[PDB]
């Protein structure tokens, strides 16, 4: 197995996947690495299994249909993995914890949002459809773009949103377009 966490790229107390060479910190994995379970398969392996069980699941989909799906177990897993892929980018640090807003010439957002809040919301089964999760994710970046206005720091929101959106298109097999 790898000797660094797949998500944060640090050593420490690592849990190893039995079906692939990835490793994880307990709370870096989503869901948090399960207490017992031997063998244990990580989220990357669990997603790969879904695909192998239903090869047609990789055919193209419309975003509108994906968003209206109910959060049954497979969709719950896919949103967990998508959240995880965002945390895998080091620029996620900026969006992880609860933000505060005090900048001359800007007003904070009406509905603040952050990764750890989405993480808790998924854990507590608060989203009933994929749309709920995707709306909160996109709101993170939209709030940032609006608040930072012309400061070059706005680019961090663009960058992390692009990671989100590429991974959304991949994980949910969104039909490719120009």
Residues that bind Zn ion (CB under 5 A): 5, 7-8, 17, 20, 22, 25, 28, 42, 44-45, 54
Preceding peptide of 31 cis, ω within 30°: yes
Residue closer to Zn ion (CB basis): 8 or 96: 8
Nearest alpha carbon to residue 169 among 52, 60, 75: 60
Give the separation between CA 140 and CA 88, rounded to whole angstroms: 16
Name every residue whose Cβ is closer than 8 Å to that of residue 25 and which is 6 or more positions away in sequence.
5, 7, 8, 10, 12, 13, 14, 15, 33
CB of 163 vs Zn ion, minimal distance in Å: 17
Q: Contact, 18 vs 59, CB < 8 A? A: no
* Residue 153 tokens, joined: 């720091």
Minimum CB distance to Zn ion, residue 40 (Å): 8
If the CB atoms of residues 45 and 50 are measured against Zn ion, the closer one turns out to be: 45
The CB-of-61 to Zn ion minimum distance in angstroms stands at 15
Shortest gap between Cβ of 23 and Zn ion (angstroms)?
9
Comparison of 16 and 139: residue with beta carbon closer to Zn ion? 16
The 3-state DSSP class for residue 175 equals coil
In the complex with Zn ion, which residue's Cβ is closer, 25 or 144? 25
Angle (CA) 41 176 89, round 5°: 45
Q: Between the CA of residue 160 and those of 8, 37, 122, what are the distances in Å?
A: 15, 33, 20
Question: Nearer Cβ to Zn ion, position 134 or 171?
Answer: 171
Least distance in angstroms from the C-beta of 119 to Zn ion:
14
């Amino acid at each position: 197995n790898s000797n660094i966490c797949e998500v944060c790229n640090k050593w420490g107390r690592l849990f190893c996947c039995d079906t692939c060479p990835r490793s994880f910190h307990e709370h870096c994995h989503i869901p948090s690495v399960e207490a017992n379970k031997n063998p244990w398969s990580c989220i990357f392996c669990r997603i790969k299994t879904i695909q192998e069980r239903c090869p047609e699941s990789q055919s193209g989909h419309q975003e509108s249909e994906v968003l209206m799906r109910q959060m049954l177990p497979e969709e719950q897993l896919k949103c967990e993995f998508l959240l995880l892929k965002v945390y895998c980018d080091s620029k996620s640090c900026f969006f992880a914890s609860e933000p505060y807003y005090n900048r001359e010439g800007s007003q904070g957002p009406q509905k603040p949002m952050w990764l750890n809040k989405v993480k808790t919301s998924l854990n507590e089964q608060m989203y009933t459809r994929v749309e709920g999760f995707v709306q909160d994710m996109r709101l993170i970046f939209h709030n940032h773009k609006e608040f930072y206005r012309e400061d070059k720091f706005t680019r961090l929101g663009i960058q992390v949103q692009d990671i989100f959106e590429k991974n959304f298109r991949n994980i949910f097999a969104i039909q490719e377009t120009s």
